[PDB]
């Protein structure tokens, strides 16, 4: 179990760690988060009490270094940083635990939610979507735009998701216009899985990362990407059977963890009714279908 210490908490802020969040008052004695489970990526995010706009946060993996938070009063935000000096870090963390000023990552033992939401998410893949290679952690926020979004403006601050476009040459083979548009199996299986992603685990990882950026930051372009990767599978007649079963589990926990009062903007009516009720895979998402019906029967 690892620790993300905080230098101080000078401004009133709602802090999140994965699917948990805590309210911290201006200059409240707060020096970080302990007992963070090793073996998964994590995200630590922020919403200032004064500006409900711009949620922001950092994706990180504690196996990849020692990381801490410090408020920057010039740039006006809580910044993640890496401590290279291991002994300086152990000592900061020990002093803060001894004075019991750290909150404990509050994992229920029976609960696999975070694992289920991040099963396929790798930090090495996050870092290729969020390009900033001088740091081992990745910044994301509400307003960042995606590469596809930027085609239709600052590239350093883009989310480099894989571009999916059903009405593109990449998606439609010459001579197979109707076939490839009504049955996206060749685009899913040959172009994306074999060509670009290499395997389904990387595909599932980007899909999972997109959903989480949409949920935690209200990032609209991540939400477009998530729905797009769902719809590409649902609109393929020919999907490996292991992928469909895993997709059903993935979507189930995403739908289970979503804030109930956010389903209006985060969930796209057309994609879901199509995937669940018209698509080739309308009958392969039993669990996802059951939780959507019992929880958002209005959407459908």
């Amino acid at each position: 179990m690892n620790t993300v210490p905080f230098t101080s908490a000078p401004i009133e802020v709602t802090i999140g760690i994965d699917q948990y969040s805590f309210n911290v008052k201006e200059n409240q004695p707060f020096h970080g988060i302990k007992d963070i489970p090793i073996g998964h990526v994590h995200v630590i995010h922020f919403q200032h009490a004064d500006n409900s706009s711009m949620r922001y946060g950092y994706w990180f993996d504690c196996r990849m270094g020692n990381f801490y938070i410090q408020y920057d009063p010039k740039d006006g935000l809580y910044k993640m940083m890496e401590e290279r000096d291991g002994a300086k870090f152990e000592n900061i963390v020990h002093n803060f635990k001894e004075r019991q000023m750290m909150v404990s990552y509050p994992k229920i033992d029976e609960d696999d939610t975070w694992y289920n939401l991040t099963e396929f998410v790798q930090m090495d893949k996050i870092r290729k979507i969020v390009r900033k290679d001088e740091n081992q952690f990745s910044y994301v926020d509400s307003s960042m735009t995606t590469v596809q979004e930027n085609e239709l403006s600052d590239p350093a601050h883009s989310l480099n998701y894989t571009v999916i476009n059903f009405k593109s040459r990449e998606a439609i083979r010459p001579g197979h216009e109707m076939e490839d548009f009504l049955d996206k199996s060749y685009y899913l299986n040959t172009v994306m899985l074999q060509g670009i992603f290499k395997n389904s685990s990387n595909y599932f990882g980007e899909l999972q990362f997109a959903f989480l950026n949409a949920m935690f930051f209200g990032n609209y372009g991540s939400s477009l990407q998530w729905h797009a990767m769902i719809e590409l599978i649902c609109s393929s007649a020919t999907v490996p059977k292991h992928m469909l079963d895993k997709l059903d589990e993935i979507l189930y926990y995403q739908i289970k963890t979503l804030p109930e009062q956010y389903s209006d903007i985060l969930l796209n009516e057309r994609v879901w009714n199509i995937c669940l009720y018209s698509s080739f895979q309308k009958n392969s998402l039993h669990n996802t279908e059951k939780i959507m019906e019992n929880k958002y029967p209005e959407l459908l």
Binding site: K167, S168, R169, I172, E177, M178, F181
Partner: protein
Amino acid sequence: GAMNSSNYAELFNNDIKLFVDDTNVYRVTVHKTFEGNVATKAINGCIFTLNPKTGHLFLKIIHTSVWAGQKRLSQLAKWKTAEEVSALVRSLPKEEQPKQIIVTRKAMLDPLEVHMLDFPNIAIRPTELRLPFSAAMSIDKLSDVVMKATEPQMVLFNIYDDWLDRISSYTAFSRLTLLLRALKTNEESAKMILLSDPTITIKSYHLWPSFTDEQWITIESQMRDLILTEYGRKYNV
């Protein structure tokens, strides 16, 4: 954007554009089987592709053989239409290719867009207009060539005959739409109106009678009267 009564005169500017109507591509009679079930029998169809500027009617004849052994034929018909329109554009020299294609039914948008992926600078547009192009098979010469075809064909018609020598594209288009609207609402009376006077004839390469300017006015008036009456009957007004 979408084409409507506000941006109507755009059809007659000097940007090449085509209307595409797919209503008569897939045509069936419906009949009873020996066992008392219902089956369809297809007949020859056509894509109606019209330059509203010159009068060119690129009529692509859709032979019943294109449906043989195929399923979901009303959906295929839309893709076949898009395939044939795209092939036509490819066959044309660059300076003859349209800058816009306006489809009369929105279901054609995605099939055409997909088939035209190679022409990113051709705009594909729907329209809010209720154009009467479905009535094209009420034009005797066009119906005849479609029904007699024994193979796929493309026949180039001048749907304005020689009108542009005397009137503008705008006025020619309005005359065409008025004739087709009349044929669509009451084919019998519409055709009675056009052929009542045996002294008026149709030029061998032309679709409509040789009316003088004043006869066209009388005809155009008779066609309006027809279209209004039929409307009273329709609704009870």
